[PDB]
Amino acid sequence: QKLSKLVEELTTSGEPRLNPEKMKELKKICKSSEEQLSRAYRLLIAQLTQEHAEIRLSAFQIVEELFVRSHQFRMLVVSNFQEFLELTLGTDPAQPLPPPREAAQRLRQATTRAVEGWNEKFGEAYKKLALGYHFLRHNKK
Amino acid sequence: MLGFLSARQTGLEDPLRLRRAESTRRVLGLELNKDRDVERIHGGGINTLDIEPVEGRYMLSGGSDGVIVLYDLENSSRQSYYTCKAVCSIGRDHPDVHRYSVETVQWYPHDTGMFTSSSFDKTLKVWDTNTLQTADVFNFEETVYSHHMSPVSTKHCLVAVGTRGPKVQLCDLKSGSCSHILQGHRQEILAVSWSPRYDYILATASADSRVKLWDVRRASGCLITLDQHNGKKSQAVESANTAHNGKVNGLCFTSDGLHLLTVGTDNRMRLWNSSNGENTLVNYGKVCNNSKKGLKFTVSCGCSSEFVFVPYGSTIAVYTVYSGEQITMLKGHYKTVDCCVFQSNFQELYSGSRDCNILAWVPSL
């Protein structure tokens, strides 16, 4: 719906840059209804699973901004988020063989910095962020 | 629960009913408690955990980094949130610390003052918990995959040790004799487990796809060799009578010791009659293990229906032992799960993994 419209308007790689007005509109829409974000993750898995690395970066940034801002993606990334733990363990680490890793190295660095930020941003009881960061630092950063 | 309380209060139902039913409900409601943590002390993956059998207060943990950690599992703080603090630790600076991976650690049954731990440095060390010093060391000619002391023998205090050699070493902690060998396997023994029922029954599983039950008193070889088919494919025993179609890397007797659970690298778990080694044909589906070493898995105790918690990749798969129905998968680890250990007092689980973490699973509500 409108979630998909905003996802298309933002993830488009023809203008691959962070736009604040669209992101604040998405934040306000997600705050208006929690069900906006539960399908948004499904949209983001579309963008993470897409061929273009810029779309993956865009969907990662959208997920991060919804988790840190909307207060509805927080209840997806810091509660009922084993999908998020597995996507963190599969994104930076090697994709499970035979399937190899398809993201770009700049996207790996962006994910590393996002994990380092989220270690302190929301870690009141979610320590698997830090545990995954340590595993990366000792196995496939 | 109120019906259960009233039936217990009025004598309609035995209190055993409420204990077993509520314990079963708690096990089914087992979930990753972020309201409890285990202090991270291992620099490497935890290969083994062992909660003491008496009082279930303290836990041992052996890592691939060669260190041993001794944790307190009781909430000594008044808060509802606490961290299972590390009481002691055989660290990198302890003169007796293991040079390589600690693959198994076991509390001495019948008392908390002693515990034994085996490593790929080809040693089984006996530690005095109080002094935290080695009391004895058993060197072996080849790396140890598993050791086990009988949880039940008030008479003998043998440690069954399985190494890469085809022979099973029996080491007497009572005055030291590590010469006895049980021969009959053909490849590395990846798991050893004494029966909890019979003092002298030892089940040993090896990479040659065979599980053998021995009577260590007996001087005439294995009692029984587990057979997948029970006779449908029958051959003069030189290569047949395999428990699994790969390496058998895990053993666990059920609580009463009347059945044996074996997990092998054919991605199967089988349930066997421990008296005549007959496969019970419990399905269990597919149990993913590709471990190249021993796989430590446990069963539940004191519930209405018995459960088995088996490491399933990065998760812990929970199955009903006598029906095969997979209860659930506990998903909280980031790398492969190497060992899980059951706290029977409160139906709690602790699982170690290659991600250098020990996760506590507590029943929810």
Side-chain angles (χ1 to χ4, degrees), chain A residues 14 16 20 40 46 53 59 90 93-94 96 98-100 103-104 110 114 117 123 125 130 132, chain B:
Chain B
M1 178 88 217
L2 290 177
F4 280 111
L5 281 171
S6 63
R8 202 185 60 165
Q9 199 168 16
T10 48
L12 277 296
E13 294 294 328
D14 192 335
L16 187 153
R17 296 291 185 270
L18 194 147
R19 277 188 292 113
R20 294 195 164 244
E22 191 277 332
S23 306
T24 304
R25 183 179 63 83
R26 293 193 82 206
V27 168
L28 305 158
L30 185 63
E31 189 276 331
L32 184 63
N33 199 234
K34 294 172 182 182
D35 208 6
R36 182 192 304 191
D37 281 312
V38 183
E39 176 175 8
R40 185 180 67 189
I41 301 299
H42 286 279
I46 295 94
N47 298 114
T48 186
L49 304 162
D50 195 73
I51 312 179
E52 65 183 1
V54 300
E55 183 178 1
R57 167 162 185 192
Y58 297 102
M59 193 174 63
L60 291 158
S61 87
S64 292
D65 51 340
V67 307
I68 302 172
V69 187
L70 169 52
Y71 299 98
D72 203 324
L73 304 184
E74 310 272 29
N75 187 357
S76 296
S77 73
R78 295 180 174 86
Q79 294 82 17
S80 280
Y81 182 76
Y82 72 107
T83 61
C84 306
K85 293 179 179 179
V87 176
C88 293
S89 177
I90 315 293
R92 294 182 183 174
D93 45 346
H94 199 299
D96 297 332
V97 65
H98 278 294
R99 295 293 86 193
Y100 292 91
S101 173
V102 179
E103 274 316 312
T104 313
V105 68
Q106 171 159 2
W107 285 99
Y108 179 60
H110 323 111
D111 189 358
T112 185
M114 209 212 79
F115 67 94
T116 72
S117 71
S118 65
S119 175
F120 290 165
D121 66 22
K122 309 164 177 172
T123 66
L124 162 62
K125 292 172 198 276
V126 181
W127 309 85
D128 175 4
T129 312
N130 291 336
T131 61
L132 211 70
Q133 299 298 320
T134 58
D136 200 353
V137 189
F138 296 86
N139 296 278
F140 304 96
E141 301 86 341
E142 209 164 14
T143 70
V144 185
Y145 279 118
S146 58
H147 80 274
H148 198 253
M149 280 180 289
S150 195
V152 72
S153 296
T154 43
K155 293 179 179 179
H156 77 73
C157 176
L158 314 166
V159 193
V161 185
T163 78
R164 291 193 65 71
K167 293 146 169 55
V168 186
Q169 316 276 125
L170 298 185
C171 312
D172 210 332
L173 297 197
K174 290 179 179 179
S175 186
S177 66
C178 53
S179 55
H180 194 293
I181 48 164
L182 312 157
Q183 69 276 17
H185 274 312
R186 286 189 284 81
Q187 294 179 357
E188 58 251 50
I189 297 89
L190 297 169
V192 293
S193 198
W194 297 92
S195 189
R197 178 167 282 288
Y198 305 112
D199 291 331
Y200 291 103
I201 295 298
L202 172 70
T204 67
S206 162
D208 62 350
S209 296
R210 289 180 179 184
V211 180
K212 291 183 176 268
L213 286 149
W214 314 79
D215 181 348
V216 300
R217 301 182 305 206
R218 195 152 313 183
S220 65
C222 70
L223 286 185
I224 307 154
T225 309
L226 273 47
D227 186 6
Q228 281 162 289
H229 323 294
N230 309 322
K232 293 179 179 179
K233 306 175 181 51
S234 188
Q235 171 168 56
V237 188
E238 182 61 52
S239 193
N241 296 115
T242 59
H244 290 250
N245 281 356
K247 311 162 97 169
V248 186
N249 53 9
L251 286 175
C252 192
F253 283 94
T254 62
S255 304
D256 47 26
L258 300 173
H259 287 98
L260 180 62
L261 285 157
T262 77
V263 304
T265 65
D266 58 325
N267 298 293
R268 294 288 181 280
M269 181 163 70
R270 302 201 157 78
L271 181 74
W272 315 85
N273 184 299
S274 74
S275 290
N276 65 322
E278 189 159 61
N279 192 5
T280 63
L281 277 296
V282 174
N283 193 14
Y284 294 115
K286 183 178 179 180
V287 184
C288 276
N289 59 345
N290 50 358
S291 190
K292 300 290 94 176
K293 47 160 169 78
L295 190 67
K296 327 298 205 315
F297 70 114
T298 175
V299 292
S300 74
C301 202
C303 304
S304 72
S305 62
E306 194 152 343
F307 302 97
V308 55
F309 309 88
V310 60
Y312 196 117
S314 279
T315 79
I316 297 94
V318 188
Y319 298 90
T320 309
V321 170
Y322 292 114
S323 55
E325 294 293 328
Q326 189 185 236
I327 299 310
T328 187
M329 293 180 183
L330 320 175
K331 301 187 173 185
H333 281 282
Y334 285 98
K335 292 179 179 179
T336 301
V337 171
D338 290 329
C339 57
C340 51
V341 71
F342 190 68
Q343 175 72 268
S344 77
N345 277 348
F346 300 99
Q347 291 75 42
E348 293 179 353
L349 190 71
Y350 297 85
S351 57
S353 160
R354 287 180 191 181
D355 62 349
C356 316
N357 272 20
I358 308 171
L359 294 189
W361 318 85
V362 185
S364 296
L365 296 174

PDB file of all heavy atoms in Angstrom, chain B residues 271-294:
ATOM      1  N   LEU B 271      15.913 -44.210  18.969  1.00  0.00           N
ATOM      2  CA  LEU B 271      15.597 -44.625  20.325  1.00  0.00           C
ATOM      3  C   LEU B 271      15.634 -46.143  20.376  1.00  0.00           C
ATOM      4  O   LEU B 271      14.967 -46.811  19.581  1.00  0.00           O
ATOM      5  CB  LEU B 271      14.223 -44.105  20.747  1.00  0.00           C
ATOM      6  CG  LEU B 271      13.746 -44.425  22.160  1.00  0.00           C
ATOM      7  CD1 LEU B 271      14.490 -43.577  23.167  1.00  0.00           C
ATOM      8  CD2 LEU B 271      12.254 -44.216  22.273  1.00  0.00           C
ATOM      9  N   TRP B 272      16.411 -46.678  21.309  1.00  0.00           N
ATOM     10  CA  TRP B 272      16.725 -48.094  21.381  1.00  0.00           C
ATOM     11  C   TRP B 272      16.327 -48.642  22.738  1.00  0.00           C
ATOM     12  O   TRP B 272      16.449 -47.960  23.755  1.00  0.00           O
ATOM     13  CB  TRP B 272      18.216 -48.328  21.175  1.00  0.00           C
ATOM     14  CG  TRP B 272      18.778 -47.560  20.047  1.00  0.00           C
ATOM     15  CD1 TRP B 272      19.222 -46.281  20.081  1.00  0.00           C
ATOM     16  CD2 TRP B 272      18.990 -48.022  18.717  1.00  0.00           C
ATOM     17  NE1 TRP B 272      19.685 -45.904  18.854  1.00  0.00           N
ATOM     18  CE2 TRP B 272      19.555 -46.960  17.993  1.00  0.00           C
ATOM     19  CE3 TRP B 272      18.756 -49.229  18.064  1.00  0.00           C
ATOM     20  CZ2 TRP B 272      19.887 -47.068  16.653  1.00  0.00           C
ATOM     21  CZ3 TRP B 272      19.084 -49.333  16.740  1.00  0.00           C
ATOM     22  CH2 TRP B 272      19.644 -48.262  16.045  1.00  0.00           C
ATOM     23  N   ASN B 273      15.867 -49.886  22.745  1.00  0.00           N
ATOM     24  CA  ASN B 273      15.628 -50.602  23.990  1.00  0.00           C
ATOM     25  C   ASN B 273      16.973 -50.947  24.614  1.00  0.00           C
ATOM     26  O   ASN B 273      17.727 -51.758  24.071  1.00  0.00           O
ATOM     27  CB  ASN B 273      14.805 -51.855  23.714  1.00  0.00           C
ATOM     28  CG  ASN B 273      14.427 -52.593  24.972  1.00  0.00           C
ATOM     29  OD1 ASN B 273      15.289 -53.048  25.721  1.00  0.00           O
ATOM     30  ND2 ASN B 273      13.129 -52.735  25.206  1.00  0.00           N
ATOM     31  N   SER B 274      17.276 -50.348  25.763  1.00  0.00           N
ATOM     32  CA  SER B 274      18.604 -50.491  26.343  1.00  0.00           C
ATOM     33  C   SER B 274      18.893 -51.893  26.859  1.00  0.00           C
ATOM     34  O   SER B 274      20.050 -52.187  27.171  1.00  0.00           O
ATOM     35  CB  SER B 274      18.780 -49.486  27.479  1.00  0.00           C
ATOM     36  OG  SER B 274      18.051 -49.886  28.622  1.00  0.00           O
ATOM     37  N   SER B 275      17.887 -52.763  26.956  1.00  0.00           N
ATOM     38  CA  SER B 275      18.120 -54.116  27.453  1.00  0.00           C
ATOM     39  C   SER B 275      18.516 -55.071  26.335  1.00  0.00           C
ATOM     40  O   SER B 275      19.444 -55.865  26.503  1.00  0.00           O
ATOM     41  CB  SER B 275      16.888 -54.624  28.192  1.00  0.00           C
ATOM     42  OG  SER B 275      16.731 -53.917  29.407  1.00  0.00           O
ATOM     43  N   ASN B 276      17.796 -55.049  25.209  1.00  0.00           N
ATOM     44  CA  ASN B 276      18.128 -55.879  24.055  1.00  0.00           C
ATOM     45  C   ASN B 276      18.481 -55.055  22.818  1.00  0.00           C
ATOM     46  O   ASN B 276      18.531 -55.601  21.714  1.00  0.00           O
ATOM     47  CB  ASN B 276      16.978 -56.835  23.738  1.00  0.00           C
ATOM     48  CG  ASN B 276      15.726 -56.118  23.307  1.00  0.00           C
ATOM     49  OD1 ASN B 276      15.395 -55.061  23.828  1.00  0.00           O
ATOM     50  ND2 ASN B 276      15.016 -56.693  22.347  1.00  0.00           N
ATOM     51  N   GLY B 277      18.733 -53.759  22.980  1.00  0.00           N
ATOM     52  CA  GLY B 277      19.230 -52.947  21.880  1.00  0.00           C
ATOM     53  C   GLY B 277      18.334 -52.913  20.665  1.00  0.00           C
ATOM     54  O   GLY B 277      18.817 -52.676  19.555  1.00  0.00           O
ATOM     55  N   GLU B 278      17.037 -53.131  20.845  1.00  0.00           N
ATOM     56  CA  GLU B 278      16.095 -53.154  19.736  1.00  0.00           C
ATOM     57  C   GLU B 278      15.643 -51.739  19.411  1.00  0.00           C
ATOM     58  O   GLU B 278      15.237 -50.990  20.302  1.00  0.00           O
ATOM     59  CB  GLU B 278      14.890 -54.023  20.081  1.00  0.00           C
ATOM     60  CG  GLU B 278      13.961 -54.277  18.915  1.00  0.00           C
ATOM     61  CD  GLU B 278      13.088 -55.496  19.124  1.00  0.00           C
ATOM     62  OE1 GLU B 278      12.307 -55.509  20.098  1.00  0.00           O
ATOM     63  OE2 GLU B 278      13.183 -56.443  18.315  1.00  0.00           O
ATOM     64  N   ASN B 279      15.719 -51.376  18.136  1.00  0.00           N
ATOM     65  CA  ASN B 279      15.223 -50.078  17.710  1.00  0.00           C
ATOM     66  C   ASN B 279      13.726 -50.000  17.964  1.00  0.00           C
ATOM     67  O   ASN B 279      12.973 -50.904  17.593  1.00  0.00           O
ATOM     68  CB  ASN B 279      15.528 -49.863  16.229  1.00  0.00           C
ATOM     69  CG  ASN B 279      15.314 -48.437  15.792  1.00  0.00           C
ATOM     70  OD1 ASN B 279      15.020 -47.567  16.605  1.00  0.00           O
ATOM     71  ND2 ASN B 279      15.471 -48.185  14.501  1.00  0.00           N
ATOM     72  N   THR B 280      13.294 -48.917  18.603  1.00  0.00           N
ATOM     73  CA  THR B 280      11.880 -48.722  18.887  1.00  0.00           C
ATOM     74  C   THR B 280      11.116 -48.138  17.708  1.00  0.00           C
ATOM     75  O   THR B 280       9.891 -48.014  17.790  1.00  0.00           O
ATOM     76  CB  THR B 280      11.708 -47.814  20.104  1.00  0.00           C
ATOM     77  OG1 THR B 280      12.258 -46.526  19.820  1.00  0.00           O
ATOM     78  CG2 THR B 280      12.404 -48.402  21.320  1.00  0.00           C
ATOM     79  N   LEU B 281      11.805 -47.772  16.628  1.00  0.00           N
ATOM     80  CA  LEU B 281      11.181 -47.229  15.422  1.00  0.00           C
ATOM     81  C   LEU B 281      10.450 -45.915  15.702  1.00  0.00           C
ATOM     82  O   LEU B 281       9.506 -45.552  15.000  1.00  0.00           O
ATOM     83  CB  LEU B 281      10.239 -48.254  14.769  1.00  0.00           C
ATOM     84  CG  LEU B 281      10.856 -49.315  13.847  1.00  0.00           C
ATOM     85  CD1 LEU B 281      11.493 -48.692  12.606  1.00  0.00           C
ATOM     86  CD2 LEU B 281      11.870 -50.165  14.589  1.00  0.00           C
ATOM     87  N   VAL B 282      10.889 -45.176  16.720  1.00  0.00           N
ATOM     88  CA  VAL B 282      10.414 -43.810  16.892  1.00  0.00           C
ATOM     89  C   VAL B 282      11.035 -42.951  15.803  1.00  0.00           C
ATOM     90  O   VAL B 282      12.239 -43.040  15.528  1.00  0.00           O
ATOM     91  CB  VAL B 282      10.757 -43.289  18.298  1.00  0.00           C
ATOM     92  CG1 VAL B 282      10.398 -41.814  18.444  1.00  0.00           C
ATOM     93  CG2 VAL B 282      10.041 -44.111  19.352  1.00  0.00           C
ATOM     94  N   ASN B 283      10.219 -42.108  15.173  1.00  0.00           N
ATOM     95  CA  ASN B 283      10.656 -41.466  13.941  1.00  0.00           C
ATOM     96  C   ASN B 283      11.641 -40.334  14.207  1.00  0.00           C
ATOM     97  O   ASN B 283      12.784 -40.375  13.741  1.00  0.00           O
ATOM     98  CB  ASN B 283       9.446 -40.948  13.163  1.00  0.00           C
ATOM     99  CG  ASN B 283       9.796 -40.548  11.745  1.00  0.00           C
ATOM    100  OD1 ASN B 283      10.865 -40.890  11.238  1.00  0.00           O
ATOM    101  ND2 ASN B 283       8.897 -39.819  11.095  1.00  0.00           N
ATOM    102  N   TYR B 284      11.208 -39.304  14.932  1.00  0.00           N
ATOM    103  CA  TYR B 284      11.957 -38.087  15.234  1.00  0.00           C
ATOM    104  C   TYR B 284      12.211 -37.217  14.008  1.00  0.00           C
ATOM    105  O   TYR B 284      12.782 -36.133  14.153  1.00  0.00           O
ATOM    106  CB  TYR B 284      13.316 -38.362  15.898  1.00  0.00           C
ATOM    107  CG  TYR B 284      13.229 -38.964  17.274  1.00  0.00           C
ATOM    108  CD1 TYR B 284      13.692 -40.242  17.518  1.00  0.00           C
ATOM    109  CD2 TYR B 284      12.690 -38.253  18.330  1.00  0.00           C
ATOM    110  CE1 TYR B 284      13.619 -40.797  18.765  1.00  0.00           C
ATOM    111  CE2 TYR B 284      12.607 -38.802  19.584  1.00  0.00           C
ATOM    112  CZ  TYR B 284      13.076 -40.074  19.795  1.00  0.00           C
ATOM    113  OH  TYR B 284      13.001 -40.634  21.041  1.00  0.00           O
ATOM    114  N   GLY B 285      11.798 -37.635  12.813  1.00  0.00           N
ATOM    115  CA  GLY B 285      12.089 -36.831  11.646  1.00  0.00           C
ATOM    116  C   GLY B 285      13.583 -36.756  11.377  1.00  0.00           C
ATOM    117  O   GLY B 285      14.339 -37.702  11.616  1.00  0.00           O
ATOM    118  N   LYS B 286      14.010 -35.601  10.878  1.00  0.00           N
ATOM    119  CA  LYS B 286      15.405 -35.333  10.558  1.00  0.00           C
ATOM    120  C   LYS B 286      15.989 -34.448  11.647  1.00  0.00           C
ATOM    121  O   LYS B 286      15.439 -33.383  11.943  1.00  0.00           O
ATOM    122  CB  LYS B 286      15.540 -34.668   9.187  1.00  0.00           C
ATOM    123  CG  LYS B 286      16.976 -34.422   8.755  1.00  0.00           C
ATOM    124  CD  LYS B 286      17.039 -33.805   7.367  1.00  0.00           C
ATOM    125  CE  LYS B 286      18.474 -33.538   6.945  1.00  0.00           C
ATOM    126  NZ  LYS B 286      18.549 -32.933   5.586  1.00  0.00           N
ATOM    127  N   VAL B 287      17.100 -34.887  12.232  1.00  0.00           N
ATOM    128  CA  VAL B 287      17.769 -34.179  13.320  1.00  0.00           C
ATOM    129  C   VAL B 287      19.120 -33.749  12.768  1.00  0.00           C
ATOM    130  O   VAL B 287      20.055 -34.552  12.697  1.00  0.00           O
ATOM    131  CB  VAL B 287      17.920 -35.047  14.574  1.00  0.00           C
ATOM    132  CG1 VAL B 287      18.524 -34.246  15.717  1.00  0.00           C
ATOM    133  CG2 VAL B 287      16.580 -35.632  14.990  1.00  0.00           C
ATOM    134  N   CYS B 288      19.230 -32.483  12.382  1.00  0.00           N
ATOM    135  CA  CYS B 288      20.424 -31.986  11.709  1.00  0.00           C
ATOM    136  C   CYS B 288      21.590 -31.913  12.682  1.00  0.00           C
ATOM    137  O   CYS B 288      21.621 -31.048  13.561  1.00  0.00           O
ATOM    138  CB  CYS B 288      20.154 -30.611  11.109  1.00  0.00           C
ATOM    139  SG  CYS B 288      19.369 -30.633   9.489  1.00  0.00           S
ATOM    140  N   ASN B 289      22.552 -32.814  12.529  1.00  0.00           N
ATOM    141  CA  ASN B 289      23.875 -32.636  13.104  1.00  0.00           C
ATOM    142  C   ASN B 289      24.916 -33.016  12.066  1.00  0.00           C
ATOM    143  O   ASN B 289      24.771 -34.022  11.367  1.00  0.00           O
ATOM    144  CB  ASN B 289      24.071 -33.464  14.379  1.00  0.00           C
ATOM    145  CG  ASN B 289      23.897 -34.944  14.149  1.00  0.00           C
ATOM    146  OD1 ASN B 289      23.369 -35.365  13.124  1.00  0.00           O
ATOM    147  ND2 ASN B 289      24.359 -35.745  15.096  1.00  0.00           N
ATOM    148  N   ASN B 290      25.954 -32.194  11.962  1.00  0.00           N
ATOM    149  CA  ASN B 290      27.125 -32.492  11.147  1.00  0.00           C
ATOM    150  C   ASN B 290      28.389 -32.338  11.979  1.00  0.00           C
ATOM    151  O   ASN B 290      29.464 -32.053  11.447  1.00  0.00           O
ATOM    152  CB  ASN B 290      27.177 -31.595   9.912  1.00  0.00           C
ATOM    153  CG  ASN B 290      27.006 -30.131  10.251  1.00  0.00           C
ATOM    154  OD1 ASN B 290      26.806 -29.770  11.411  1.00  0.00           O
ATOM    155  ND2 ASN B 290      27.080 -29.277   9.237  1.00  0.00           N
ATOM    156  N   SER B 291      28.265 -32.529  13.287  1.00  0.00           N
ATOM    157  CA  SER B 291      29.389 -32.329  14.185  1.00  0.00           C
ATOM    158  C   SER B 291      30.479 -33.354  13.911  1.00  0.00           C
ATOM    159  O   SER B 291      30.206 -34.544  13.739  1.00  0.00           O
ATOM    160  CB  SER B 291      28.924 -32.433  15.635  1.00  0.00           C
ATOM    161  OG  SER B 291      29.936 -32.010  16.527  1.00  0.00           O
ATOM    162  N   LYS B 292      31.718 -32.883  13.869  1.00  0.00           N
ATOM    163  CA  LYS B 292      32.874 -33.751  13.716  1.00  0.00           C
ATOM    164  C   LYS B 292      33.401 -34.252  15.052  1.00  0.00           C
ATOM    165  O   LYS B 292      34.382 -35.003  15.073  1.00  0.00           O
ATOM    166  CB  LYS B 292      33.988 -33.014  12.967  1.00  0.00           C
ATOM    167  CG  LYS B 292      33.632 -32.545  11.551  1.00  0.00           C
ATOM    168  CD  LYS B 292      33.490 -33.692  10.547  1.00  0.00           C
ATOM    169  CE  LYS B 292      32.050 -34.178  10.393  1.00  0.00           C
ATOM    170  NZ  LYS B 292      31.928 -35.222   9.337  1.00  0.00           N
ATOM    171  N   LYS B 293      32.778 -33.852  16.158  1.00  0.00           N
ATOM    172  CA  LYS B 293      33.151 -34.313  17.485  1.00  0.00           C
ATOM    173  C   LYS B 293      31.909 -34.792  18.224  1.00  0.00           C
ATOM    174  O   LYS B 293      30.823 -34.858  17.640  1.00  0.00           O
ATOM    175  CB  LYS B 293      33.855 -33.190  18.246  1.00  0.00           C
ATOM    176  CG  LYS B 293      33.136 -31.862  18.171  1.00  0.00           C
ATOM    177  CD  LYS B 293      33.582 -30.946  19.285  1.00  0.00           C
ATOM    178  CE  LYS B 293      33.083 -29.529  19.093  1.00  0.00           C
ATOM    179  NZ  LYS B 293      31.656 -29.391  19.487  1.00  0.00           N
ATOM    180  N   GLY B 294      32.055 -35.131  19.502  1.00  0.00           N
ATOM    181  CA  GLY B 294      30.908 -35.580  20.269  1.00  0.00           C
ATOM    182  C   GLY B 294      29.862 -34.488  20.396  1.00  0.00           C
ATOM    183  O   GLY B 294      30.181 -33.307  20.554  1.00  0.00           O
TER     184      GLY B 294
END
